[PDB]
Amino acid sequence: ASGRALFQYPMTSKIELNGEINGKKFKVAGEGFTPSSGRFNMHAYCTTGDLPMSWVVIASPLFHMFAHYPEDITHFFQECFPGSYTLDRTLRMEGDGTLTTHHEYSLEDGCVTSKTTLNASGFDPKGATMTKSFVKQLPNEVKITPHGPNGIRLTSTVLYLKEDGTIQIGTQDCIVTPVGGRKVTQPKAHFLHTQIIQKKDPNDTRDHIVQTELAVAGNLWHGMDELYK
Ligand SMILES: [Cl-]
Ligand SMILES: [Cl-]
Ligand SMILES: [Cl-]
User: Fold this and answer.
1) From the CA of 228, which ligand is nearest?
2) Which ligand is nearest to the CA of 134?
3) What angle do CA 16, 20, 63 make, to 5 degrees?
4) For the chain: N or C, fewer Cβ within 10 A?
């Protein structure tokens, strides 16, 4: 049983995230639900107090294996199981600061657990990340290409909406590496349309978010794959 056969829905998730921003250490945990392919939620909370940064910027740190792929594109993230993968991210909030994350995953009993670390240094203490002035991030197309002999690379430029209705840009670059000691067939170059929506739970007393991601792959530019050898 491997690959897509391991991702029979519904499934769940957990996260444990240890973070630090501008020397403020924090932890987040969460549980989530994946009802069906490409629709996945996460109810996360800060276990150390209030989260010391925007929940909108931490959105993308907070599960590409749940993306919905058509049959005619390899779902590299799912095909890494069994064995799993690592994700390494850099997110540059342009004119603000840069953060990195590292993710490890494990699958047990229909539940993907993410263990994540986040590090962020040099942020503007008056910027939107640290003052919590973002409302949401706009939907975007992540570009996925083969990377090295055994990985993939994911890139996106994300528009973050501030409370005054103007935009700040984050540039995001991720590398995915199988850790399972085996070659996983790389996909053709493609794109993943991604949308995050966040809301608050009516009752939860913790600093928290209830986030849903919708993520759908597609060969949006059929000529792109020619460019990546
Ligand atoms: Cl926030
Ligand atoms: Cl990403
Ligand atoms: Cl493919």
Assistant:
1) 3
2) 1
3) 35
4) C
